[PDB]
Design a protein around this motif. Structure first.
Motif, PDB file in Angstrom:
ATOM      1  N   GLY A 148      44.553  33.770  47.469  1.00 29.38           N
ATOM      2  CA  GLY A 148      44.285  34.580  46.296  1.00 29.38           C
ATOM      3  C   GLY A 148      42.811  34.730  46.007  1.00 29.38           C
ATOM      4  N   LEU A 149      42.497  35.763  45.229  1.00 30.45           N
ATOM      5  CA  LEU A 149      41.130  36.048  44.817  1.00 30.45           C
ATOM      6  C   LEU A 149      41.135  36.585  43.395  1.00 30.45           C
ATOM      7  CD1 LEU A 149      38.167  36.078  45.744  1.00 30.45           C
ATOM      8  CD2 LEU A 149      38.503  38.451  46.451  1.00 30.45           C
ATOM      9  N   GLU A 150      40.363  35.944  42.520  1.00 34.02           N
ATOM     10  CA  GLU A 150      40.176  36.383  41.146  1.00 34.02           C
ATOM     11  C   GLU A 150      38.685  36.543  40.885  1.00 34.02           C
ATOM     12  OE1 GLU A 150      41.907  33.804  38.254  1.00 34.02           O
ATOM     13  OE2 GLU A 150      41.495  35.131  36.555  1.00 34.02           O
ATOM     14  N   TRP A 151      38.334  37.481  40.011  1.00 37.96           N
ATOM     15  CA  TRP A 151      36.929  37.790  39.803  1.00 37.96           C
ATOM     16  C   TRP A 151      36.674  38.147  38.347  1.00 37.96           C
ATOM     17  CZ3 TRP A 151      40.316  40.637  42.725  1.00 37.96           C
ATOM     18  CH2 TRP A 151      40.686  41.886  42.215  1.00 37.96           C
ATOM     19  N   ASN A 152      35.412  38.007  37.954  1.00 37.21           N
ATOM     20  CA  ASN A 152      34.901  38.492  36.680  1.00 37.21           C
ATOM     21  C   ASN A 152      33.413  38.775  36.863  1.00 37.21           C
ATOM     22  OD1 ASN A 152      33.178  36.306  35.853  1.00 37.21           O
ATOM     23  ND2 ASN A 152      34.886  35.203  34.920  1.00 37.21           N
ATOM     24  N   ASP A 153      32.744  39.167  35.782  1.00 35.70           N
ATOM     25  CA  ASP A 153      31.342  39.558  35.872  1.00 35.70           C
ATOM     26  C   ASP A 153      30.397  38.384  36.092  1.00 35.70           C
ATOM     27  OD1 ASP A 153      32.171  42.129  35.542  1.00 35.70           O
ATOM     28  OD2 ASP A 153      31.038  42.522  33.707  1.00 35.70           O
ATOM     29  N   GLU A 154      30.882  37.153  36.032  1.00 33.87           N
ATOM     30  CA  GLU A 154      30.008  36.001  36.239  1.00 33.87           C
ATOM     31  C   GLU A 154      30.484  35.075  37.347  1.00 33.87           C
ATOM     32  OE1 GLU A 154      31.268  36.708  33.128  1.00 33.87           O
ATOM     33  OE2 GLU A 154      29.507  37.737  32.316  1.00 33.87           O
ATOM     34  N   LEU A 155      31.792  34.980  37.577  1.00 40.28           N
ATOM     35  CA  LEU A 155      32.347  34.005  38.505  1.00 40.28           C
ATOM     36  C   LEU A 155      33.436  34.641  39.359  1.00 40.28           C
ATOM     37  CD1 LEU A 155      33.002  30.835  39.271  1.00 40.28           C
ATOM     38  CD2 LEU A 155      34.787  31.141  37.549  1.00 40.28           C
TER      39      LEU A 155
END
Ligand SMILES: *[C@@H]1O[C@H](CO)[C@@H](O[C@@H]2O[C@H](CO)[C@@H](O)[C@H](O)[C@H]2NC(C)=O)[C@H](O)[C@H]1NC(C)=O
Ligand SMILES: *[C@@H]1O[C@H](CO)[C@@H](O)[C@H](O)[C@H]1NC(C)=O
Ligand SMILES: *[C@@H]1O[C@H](CO)[C@@H](O)[C@H](O)[C@H]1NC(C)=O
Ligand SMILES: *[C@@H]1O[C@H](CO)[C@@H](O)[C@H](O)[C@H]1NC(C)=O
Ligand SMILES: *[C@@H]1O[C@H](CO)[C@@H](O)[C@H](O)[C@H]1NC(C)=O
Ligand SMILES: *[C@@H]1O[C@H](CO)[C@@H](O)[C@H](O)[C@H]1NC(C)=O
Ligand SMILES: *[C@@H]1O[C@H](CO)[C@@H](O)[C@H](O)[C@H]1NC(C)=O
Length: 258
Positions: free
Chosen positions: A159-166
């Motif tokens: 899996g891959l999760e993302w946000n603007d910092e991490l």
């Protein structure tokens, strides 16, 4: 979460071979204690998407307005030694940095996976999977090889999760974190079928799902036995309201908030 395509059909993830506890291990990765707790987050659901083509043409799928992307594979042939790979290639867009993850079928031994951090929007999907392993992520783009564990036999969800910092990547039972300030577009393009080549082998052994909603799971640990149950409503499972809401058009709190 996926655009309507005839190729892409649904499927029960838990009903596939070697996937009896694909989600149970992922849910209990952090909750290593005893008792029942209700957790929330961009967790994968039971129904995923299988997309394949009988012909040998190049096909694409698009996931829009998603926050996390999960996928699972089938057991590798001769996993102990010369493991046989199944190719896959999905690209997460963003500015000024985008990430292309490609699992293959010059290259280091057993390092089937490659991550290409690129700052160019023009990505050639008809040439990346047709050149040599040493001429894929060459140039200013950052190339990171990684070895997907073949001994796991496809029993672990990736899996891959993302946000603007991490950005968090879940591989096997290990989660890795990278700190980077990037404006992600929350859409992923996946190229699942193409003509066979040196690095690409014509096959279809990958499930996959995109998560955009906030999913709630109740976890119970009774005498070492771990059970999980999906909740469609936090109030139904817990008897109390939740603080997560979606603002309406113009940025107004809905009338049902607590
Ligand atoms: C992913 O989403 C981004 C953000 O919406 C898309 O970029 C915009 O796409 C629209 C058309 O949908 C264009 O009119 C804009 O000019 C684009 N903006 C920028 C800053 O590039 C992007 O196209 C989407 N990608 C995919 C593959 O669907
Ligand atoms: C999953 O299994 C259930 C029964 O357990 C069945 O009703 C459902 O159609 C299956 N879903 C898919 C996508 O095959
Ligand atoms: C599996 O890998 C081992 C170790 O490299 C090798 O000796 C064996 O021949 C392989 N079996 C196959 C390719 O069927
Ligand atoms: C994966 O499969 C191989 C071959 O059957 C087996 O030896 C190995 O123990 C399996 N690994 C697991 C179940 O983690
Ligand atoms: C996806 O469907 C194809 C047929 O369209 C089938 O051959 C393949 O095994 C399926 N993949 C999985 C992971 O079940
Ligand atoms: C996500 O939540 C929205 C809220 O409007 C709902 O319409 C949609 O069906 C939900 N999606 C899933 C996959 O549960
Ligand atoms: C957890 O499981 C135990 C044992 O089956 C059961 O008695 C208990 O009610 C469960 N707790 C919750 C919150 O579902």
């Amino acid at each position: 979460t996926i655009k309507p395509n005839n190729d892409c059909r649904q499927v029960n993830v838990t009903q596939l071979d070697g996937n009896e506890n694909l989600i149970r291990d992922f849910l209990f990765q952090n909750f290593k204690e005893e008792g029942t707790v209700v957790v929330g987050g961009y967790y994968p659901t039971e129904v995923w998407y299988n997309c394949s083509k009988t012909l040998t043409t190049t096909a694409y799928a698009y996931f829009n307005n998603i926050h996390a992307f999960y996928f699972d594979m089938e057991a590798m042939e001769n996993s102990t030694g010369n493991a046989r790979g199944k190719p896959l290639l999905f690209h997460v867009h963003g500015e000024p940095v985008s990430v292309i993850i490609y699992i293959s079928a010059h290259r280091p031994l057993l390092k089937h996976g490659l991550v290409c951090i690129t700052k160019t929007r023009n990505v050639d999907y008809n040439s990346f999977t047709s050149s040599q392993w040493n001429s894929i992520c060459t140039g200013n783009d950052r190339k990171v090889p990684f070895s997907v564990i073949p001994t796991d036999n496809g029993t672990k969800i990736y899996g891959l999760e993302w946000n603007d910092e991490l950005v968090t990547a879940y591989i096997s039972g290990r989660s890795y974190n990278w700190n980077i300030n990037n404006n992600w577009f929350n859409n992923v393009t996946l190229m699942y079928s193409r003509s066979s080549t040196a690095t690409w082998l014509h096959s279809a052994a990958y499930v996959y799902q995109g998560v955009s909603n906030f999913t709630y799971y109740k976890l119970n640990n009774t005498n070492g036995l771990k059970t999980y149950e999906f909740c469609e409503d936090y109030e139904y499972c817990t008897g109390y309201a939740t603080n997560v809401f979606a603002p309406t058009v113009g940025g107004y709190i809905p009338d049902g908030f607590s």
